């Protein structure tokens with residue numbers, strides 16, 4: 001009966017708001033102010049939210065969605081039918097929540113120590129080393145140490161985690177946890193669509209890889225780089241080799257072009273974490289999008305004073321939104337600040353929907369918003385207007401190369417993480433083979449090799465945040481494809497003509513309008529609709545990303561040919 005379904009979702013909304021807000025508060029308070037007491041308040045709230053999820057989920061499952069007419073109420077009820085972990089029996093729920101905590105804590109407190117010397121944390125110490133050291137042995141110390149200390153220590157938890165996340169999935173009508181995660185896209189063709197998108201980016205990635213490999217051969221020596229092989233995984237300027245832009249200085253196409261180091265300029269001109277978020281906020285409002293409320297500035301944690309990994313927080317009351325980031329003053333982190341502020345923008349845009357529909361059109365959309373703005377921020381024009389820099393085709397290629405080292409290098413990495421996890425969850429990778437299958441994919445997709453042979457008890461996936469924190473990853477792959485589609489469309493709405501990479505949407509109210517109407521849908525409609533509102537068509541497409549990078553593909557092709565490069569590796 002329609003009226004009874006309608007009433008049921010009104011009640012679910014009122015009560016979810018209250019319970020989720022209380023849970024979010026306790027999760028914040030442990031993420032920022034670890035305390036035995038904040039971790040104890042967190043443990044209580046886990047029990048509260050489970051009980052509410054079990055209560056309304058059991059009620060939701062009594063309705064026959066097949067016979068409901070109103071499509072909103074049908075959709076909401078369908079979501080509430082999925083209890084997630086609250087479907088578990090009590091013992092197993094307890095054990096699962098404790099495993100998640102233990103894994104997340106283990107990762108966040110791990111350190112890598114010199115004997116009779118200092119102990120280094122991932123952020124900022126080890127990331128700095130991976131970004132700035134140009135010495136094979138120093139990079140290897142950090143790369144291997146982080147795996148020895150974080151990765152190996154997550155292993156004891158992972159099999160039971162898999163058992164329990166899968167058990168919950170099956171109790172909610174899925175075959176395993178990857179199935180449940182894939183379901184968030186509501187796209188039966190998802191695996192093949194993504195495969196196709198990846199395949200389209202292979203020429204650009206293989207040409208970037210070959211060019212970077214040649215430059216590493218020049219710096220690290222012929223004895224350490226095989227011009228026909230995979231690249232050692234510790235040399236790309238980043239702990240996971242997921243973005244390569246910190247080795248720009250080793251691969252600059254045209255050295256004779258001046259670029260100012262923005263880090264020096266940011267530091268010397270008195271930039272702070274606070275100032276970095278004010279610039280992000282100011283860009284959103286330039287587009288006519290919403291400012292973050294006064295409360296955001298009061299309650300956010302914008303520096304290390306904790307779980308440091310950058311994250312945006314909805315407190316499910318339509319007024320309180322926060323970022324938690326251990327911000328360092330540099331351009332890499334200004335982009336991370338923009339990313340996080342696009343999550344906040346989304347929260348604010350869909351804040352008046354029912355709480356069950358307060359998500360992105362799909363998870364990739366949530367990830368893409370901030371990155372779209374950052375694309376304009378990162379342009380040489382934009383950096384100059386911020387006083388962080390002082391024409392030529394040589395400048396163009398240099399800029400494209402910088403952008404490519406992040407955006408194109410990330411494509412195979414972002415694709416492979418959940419390829420691994422889907423096969424763990426479906427049972428085709430058992431714990432005996434976790435690590436070998438990870439490295440098979442690191443070779444197949446990224447063309448990387450481990451600098452030190454892996455050994456019994458290694459668990460390199462565990463050294464990447466998203467694995468112990470149980471955060472799906474395919475969202476980031478989708479993000480990097482679709483953010484270029486949004487840029488293309490917003491630039492076209494902004495009246496930009498000429499090379500897409502020269503576009504800066506700063507101050508375009510027209511661009512901000514396309515984004516706002518789509519964000520306002522939250523999760524109320526199939527995501528193709530939001531895709532079409534923004535772009536004029538309903539598909540995920542690598543066309544826009546290829547269009548952005550076309551000058552670089554052509555440059556890289558001619559350069560690799562000149563040196564007789566053999567693209568790929570065995």
Ligand SMILES: *[C@@H]1O[C@H](CO[C@@H]2O[C@@H](C)[C@@H](O)[C@@H](O)[C@@H]2O)[C@@H](O[C@@H]2O[C@H](CO)[C@@H](O)[C@H](O)[C@H]2NC(C)=O)[C@H](O)[C@H]1NC(C)=O
Nearest residue numbers: 005006007008009010069070071072073352353354357524
């Ligand atoms: C199908 O139902 C939605 C939801 O209606 C709201 O939620 C119900 C549970 C109940 O509380 C209703 O009184 C609410 O209206 C309808 O959506 C809304 O429509 C109103 C005006 O028509 C609009 O102002 C709201 O923003 C809409 N909210 C949404 C989309 O969540 C919807 O119109 C119903 N379908 C039709 C057209 O009959």
Ligand SMILES: CC(=O)N[C@H]1[C@H](O[C@H]2[C@H](O)[C@@H](CO)OC[C@H]2O)O[C@H](CO)[C@@H](O)[C@@H]1O
Nearest residue numbers: 010013014017317318351352353354355356
């Ligand atoms: C903040 C708020 O009150 N929003 C509600 C929402 O109600 C209305 C809202 O009054 C108007 C204007 O703000 O916009 C259309 C509706 O969304 O109702 C939601 C339940 O459907 C509730 O979650 C939300 O907090």
Ligand SMILES: O=C(O)c1cn(C2CC2)c2cc(N3CCNCC3)c(F)cc2c1=O
Nearest residue numbers: 023046049050051053054083084085086087
């Ligand atoms: O008991 C339950 O069913 C749930 C409990 N929790 C407790 C709060 C940890 C959840 C937490 C979720 N997230 C926390 C915010 N970031 C990631 C997602 C979630 F999506 C679902 C659930 C439940 O279903």
Ligand SMILES: O=C(O)c1cn(C2CC2)c2cc(N3CCNCC3)c(F)cc2c1=O
Nearest residue numbers: 020023024049053079080081082083084314
């Ligand atoms: O921010 C948070 O803490 C939560 C966020 N989410 C939403 C997903 C982002 C949740 C979703 C839950 N669901 C239960 C199962 N069916 C609907 C989804 C949940 F129980 C708890 C939470 C949170 O605590």
Ligand SMILES: C[C@H](NC(=O)O)C(=O)O
Nearest residue numbers: 242310311339465466476
């Ligand atoms: C891309 C992803 N970003 C984020 O988690 O905020 C990562 O950092 O691996």
Ligand SMILES: [Cl-]
Nearest residue numbers: 233240460461
């Ligand atoms: Cl690794």
Ligand SMILES: [Cl-]
Nearest residue numbers: 363472474475
């Ligand atoms: Cl996802």
Ligand SMILES: [Zn+2]
Nearest residue numbers: 339343366367
């Ligand atoms: Zn994000």
